[PDB]
Amino acid sequence: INVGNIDETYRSLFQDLELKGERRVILDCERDKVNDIVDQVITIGK
Amino acid sequence: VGELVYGKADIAIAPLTITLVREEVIDFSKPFMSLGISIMIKKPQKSKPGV
Amino acid sequence: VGELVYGKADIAIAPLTITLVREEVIDFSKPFMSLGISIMIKKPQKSKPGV
Amino acid sequence: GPRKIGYWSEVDKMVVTLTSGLEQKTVVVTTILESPYVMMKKNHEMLEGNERYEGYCVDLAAEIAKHCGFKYKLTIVGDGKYGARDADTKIWDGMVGELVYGKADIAIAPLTITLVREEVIDFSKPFMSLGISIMIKKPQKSKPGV
Amino acid sequence: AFLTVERMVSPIESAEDLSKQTEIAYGTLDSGSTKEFFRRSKIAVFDKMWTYMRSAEPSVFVRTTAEGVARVRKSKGKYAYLLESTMNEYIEQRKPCDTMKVGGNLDSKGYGIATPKGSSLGTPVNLAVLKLSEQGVLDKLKNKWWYDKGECG
Amino acid sequence: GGNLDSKGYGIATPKGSSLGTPVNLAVLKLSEQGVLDKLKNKWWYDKGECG
Amino acid sequence: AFLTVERMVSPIESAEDLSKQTEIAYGTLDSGSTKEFFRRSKIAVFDKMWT
Amino acid sequence: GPADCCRMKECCTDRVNECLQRYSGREDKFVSFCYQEATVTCGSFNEIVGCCYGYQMCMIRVVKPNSLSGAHEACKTVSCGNPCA
Amino acid sequence: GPADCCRMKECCTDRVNECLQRYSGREDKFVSFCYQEATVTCGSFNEIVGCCYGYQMCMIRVVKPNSLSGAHEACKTVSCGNPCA
Ligand SMILES: CC(C)S(=O)(=O)NC[C@H](C)c1ccc(-c2ccc([C@@H](C)CNS(=O)(=O)C(C)C)cc2)cc1
Ligand SMILES: N[C@@H](Cn1cc(F)c(=O)[nH]c1=O)C(=O)O
Ligand SMILES: N[C@@H](Cn1cc(F)c(=O)[nH]c1=O)C(=O)O
Ligand SMILES: N[C@@H](Cn1cc(F)c(=O)[nH]c1=O)C(=O)O
């Protein structure tokens, strides 16, 4: 999933991940993008 | 049998007695049930009288 | 059935019971006699009388 | 690419010239000789292998193996006991022992479920019900009386 | 009518009653879950029974089931044998038909297929037994090897 | 008559639960301790009003 | 014949007997291991009963 | 209408595997459960047996935590056994 | 050993066709016969039903003299019905 071209969408992707039960994720991104994604993860509690 | 010969229906599933007269105009599967001409009367009064 | 399948005989006239297993390998005419598996036991004797 | 599989002579006609692992394990089933669970056949002397034995546990073994999909070898227990642990040596004896010390892969037999065993081995849900009962000689028919 | 009907009444010796009498001797297998039951049991009645069998002489215990039953037959009904239900029902259903199952059962338990802990076979064998249970295979097997060909009436 | 099938009740846990093994052992000890039988008696026959 | 009937008192022993008669109606719980047993059971008598 | 044992088999294995990917790392404990999910989704000839019995047994007897992929890939070609009894 | 319904199906269709190419122009009349050969060779779960029933019926309802190849090619993908009943 390309996260460089994009908030709600993140919630969507993590929702389908939760249903498919894929916990394991690899973040390959800029430091800034990593921080962003993590923030969005904490906000929706993933 | 008419509906079969003149093609009103593709098949006939029913108590159709197999008869030679029909076997010539139609095809009959092996018989799926046995029967015969029998007599029906009213049930006679129950039990019996006697010495 | 063997003599029929391998062509030793042109037709079979006998008490040959119609079975699906045969009906797939040969042709059977409409049944000329009815039957079924039945039980035979020795008839109980009315004998052993006396005082 | 192309390769020679043989030759043809003026006489000999067609002559063909020139031209292990990955298997399933045998499961060892330990059982005891008890009727009507595992019994020797009448002619077992002339027979070899699992065709020697017949009984409830034998048939149950066949079924279980057929369901689980493994080749089984029926083997009677060495000492001839079910299972116990010596209070001194703390060593298991019998079928349970052969399970614990790995002399056998599975045990199909009238093996009573006990907590003491349930701690050292796994027990399937019970395939038969029972309980300790009393046996006496069949009493005389006697008489109706006055 | 009453002569046409017949039948019979089932004799019951119970268990506690067996504990109270010194007339009929009784015992169990030399080594088994049954013996271990009597031994390890904290229940009054069974404790009494165990004390009796433990100090009874000559030893009322037997090496095998066959030996025990054979001892029951030659004892003129003066010796009782405590054995597992199944074995008892089986011996009861086979000639000479001189033995019998009396009273109820002392405890309620079951047999089972044993595997070493963590074995791959454990769960599949378990499910197999469950399926055989629901399919009546277990029952049919029991019948085949017990009652079906049974030799006493 | 008798019973149609032979089965039992049991303590149920969700798959992979930690409680599975200890609860199992617990039931076994209660069985061997005679607790189960006495409990059934307490709630079945002991107060039994039909005799 | 009356005191003979006194011992004729027990017509229904097993399940099969109950399966063969439509006189005495019978059933089970709406949802339970019992009904699901009857349904999922391919055993002859129980099959008849479930049907 | 038409039910094919083969198509039922493919659907069976597939649905089992697709199920086991929800439980990853716990798979070995969930094989039977997921099998019942496949049996109930793809339908079966015998409610007791399931869609493919042999596959269920092979998997339950092989699958380890995070071993799923290879386990399924080795068990899906196995013989289903007898679908009736 | 274990017998698979799927493998049995493939074997069924294959053996049927391999039999029917022995008889030419009469194929439509011998289809059932060849089916019993496949059933008896590849084995069946129910002797009555055969290895694949739906295939047999599809063929009997399709095969015409010298129509064999296309008939078989259209009938082998059909659903087997059910091996039990
Ligand atoms: C579900 C079936 C596979 S099944 O019920 O387990 N087995 C079928 C077989 C006929 C059978 C049926 C029932 C029983 C059985 C035996 C005893 C008990 C209670 C009294 C004690 N349970 S226990 O497990 O034996 C004990 C040692 C804790 C409960 C059930 C044993 C065997
Ligand atoms: N089934 C027969 C017709 N048919 C029907 C009846 F109900 C009957 O009693 N007699 C009769 O001849 C036929 O095939 O013509
Ligand atoms: N007629 C049967 C053979 N056949 C003959 C008998 F007299 C008999 O009792 N049973 C039987 O199967 C057949 O066609 O195979
Ligand atoms: N099966 C039991 C052993 N076992 C066998 C018998 F036949 C018996 O009467 N008593 C007994 O304890 C066990 O598994 O410990």
mmCIF file of N, CA and C and ligand atoms in Angstrom, chain D residues 34 82-83 95 110-114 117, chain E residues 29 31-35 65 81-84 86-87 111, ligand 4:
data_model
loop_
_atom_site.group_PDB
_atom_site.id
_atom_site.type_symbol
_atom_site.label_atom_id
_atom_site.label_comp_id
_atom_site.label_asym_id
_atom_site.label_seq_id
_atom_site.Cartn_x
_atom_site.Cartn_y
_atom_site.Cartn_z
ATOM 1 N N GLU D 34 -6.028 -58.505 26.951
ATOM 2 C CA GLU D 34 -7.206 -58.659 27.786
ATOM 3 C C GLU D 34 -8.392 -58.954 26.877
ATOM 4 N N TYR D 82 -0.640 -52.128 33.090
ATOM 5 C CA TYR D 82 -1.308 -50.986 32.482
ATOM 6 C C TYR D 82 -0.464 -49.742 32.656
ATOM 7 N N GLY D 83 -0.429 -49.201 33.866
ATOM 8 C CA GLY D 83 0.566 -48.201 34.200
ATOM 9 C C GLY D 83 0.613 -47.869 35.678
ATOM 10 N N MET D 95 2.053 -49.651 29.941
ATOM 11 C CA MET D 95 1.788 -48.927 28.700
ATOM 12 C C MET D 95 2.086 -47.457 28.884
ATOM 13 N N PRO D 110 -7.721 -51.096 27.176
ATOM 14 C CA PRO D 110 -8.603 -50.650 28.258
ATOM 15 C C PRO D 110 -7.839 -49.884 29.325
ATOM 16 N N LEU D 111 -7.307 -48.725 28.953
ATOM 17 C CA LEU D 111 -6.523 -47.930 29.880
ATOM 18 C C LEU D 111 -7.419 -46.953 30.614
ATOM 19 N N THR D 112 -7.599 -47.217 31.900
ATOM 20 C CA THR D 112 -8.463 -46.412 32.740
ATOM 21 C C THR D 112 -7.906 -45.010 32.908
ATOM 22 N N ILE D 113 -8.766 -44.013 32.752
ATOM 23 C CA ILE D 113 -8.349 -42.637 32.936
ATOM 24 C C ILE D 113 -8.180 -42.323 34.417
ATOM 25 N N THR D 114 -6.970 -41.927 34.792
ATOM 26 C CA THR D 114 -6.679 -41.505 36.156
ATOM 27 C C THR D 114 -5.877 -40.211 36.117
ATOM 28 N N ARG D 117 -2.151 -40.394 35.796
ATOM 29 C CA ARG D 117 -1.686 -40.601 34.434
ATOM 30 C C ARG D 117 -1.931 -39.356 33.593
ATOM 31 N N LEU E 29 -7.455 -56.877 41.605
ATOM 32 C CA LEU E 29 -6.287 -57.194 40.802
ATOM 33 C C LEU E 29 -5.017 -56.857 41.583
ATOM 34 N N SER E 31 -2.177 -55.375 40.536
ATOM 35 C CA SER E 31 -1.850 -53.979 40.287
ATOM 36 C C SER E 31 -2.823 -53.389 39.276
ATOM 37 N N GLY E 32 -3.557 -52.357 39.677
ATOM 38 C CA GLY E 32 -4.513 -51.737 38.778
ATOM 39 C C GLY E 32 -5.180 -50.497 39.335
ATOM 40 N N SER E 33 -5.921 -49.804 38.474
ATOM 41 C CA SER E 33 -6.636 -48.595 38.861
ATOM 42 C C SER E 33 -7.687 -48.904 39.909
ATOM 43 N N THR E 34 -8.195 -50.131 39.879
ATOM 44 C CA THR E 34 -9.188 -50.585 40.842
ATOM 45 C C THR E 34 -8.575 -50.711 42.233
ATOM 46 N N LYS E 35 -7.462 -51.434 42.294
ATOM 47 C CA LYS E 35 -6.734 -51.599 43.543
ATOM 48 C C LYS E 35 -6.288 -50.250 44.062
ATOM 49 N N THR E 65 -7.276 -61.151 35.570
ATOM 50 C CA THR E 65 -8.730 -61.235 35.644
ATOM 51 C C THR E 65 -9.218 -62.675 35.593
ATOM 52 N N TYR E 81 -15.232 -60.989 43.810
ATOM 53 C CA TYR E 81 -14.144 -60.346 43.086
ATOM 54 C C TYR E 81 -14.532 -58.950 42.626
ATOM 55 N N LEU E 82 -13.784 -57.952 43.080
ATOM 56 C CA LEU E 82 -14.034 -56.590 42.651
ATOM 57 C C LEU E 82 -13.222 -56.332 41.394
ATOM 58 N N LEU E 83 -13.922 -56.164 40.281
ATOM 59 C CA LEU E 83 -13.265 -55.939 39.002
ATOM 60 C C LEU E 83 -13.985 -54.841 38.253
ATOM 61 N N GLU E 84 -13.356 -54.322 37.208
ATOM 62 C CA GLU E 84 -13.975 -53.285 36.395
ATOM 63 C C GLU E 84 -15.246 -53.789 35.704
ATOM 64 N N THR E 86 -16.826 -53.541 32.702
ATOM 65 C CA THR E 86 -16.704 -54.192 31.401
ATOM 66 C C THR E 86 -16.325 -55.668 31.497
ATOM 67 N N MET E 87 -15.158 -55.951 32.072
ATOM 68 C CA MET E 87 -14.703 -57.330 32.233
ATOM 69 C C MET E 87 -15.772 -58.202 32.884
ATOM 70 N N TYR E 111 -12.493 -45.515 29.974
ATOM 71 C CA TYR E 111 -11.212 -45.806 29.336
ATOM 72 C C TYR E 111 -10.852 -44.690 28.368
HETATM 73 N N1 LIG J 4 -7.684 -51.068 33.092
HETATM 74 C C1 LIG J 4 -7.190 -50.738 34.413
HETATM 75 C C2 LIG J 4 -6.568 -51.973 35.059
HETATM 76 N N2 LIG J 4 -7.597 -52.907 35.535
HETATM 77 C C3 LIG J 4 -8.068 -53.844 34.704
HETATM 78 C C4 LIG J 4 -9.038 -54.736 35.142
HETATM 79 F F1 LIG J 4 -9.523 -55.682 34.319
HETATM 80 C C5 LIG J 4 -9.533 -54.629 36.534
HETATM 81 O O1 LIG J 4 -10.405 -55.418 36.960
HETATM 82 N N3 LIG J 4 -9.024 -53.667 37.330
HETATM 83 C C6 LIG J 4 -8.080 -52.817 36.864
HETATM 84 O O2 LIG J 4 -7.631 -51.939 37.631
HETATM 85 C C7 LIG J 4 -6.179 -49.633 34.286
HETATM 86 O O3 LIG J 4 -6.065 -49.062 33.181
HETATM 87 O O4 LIG J 4 -5.497 -49.316 35.284
#
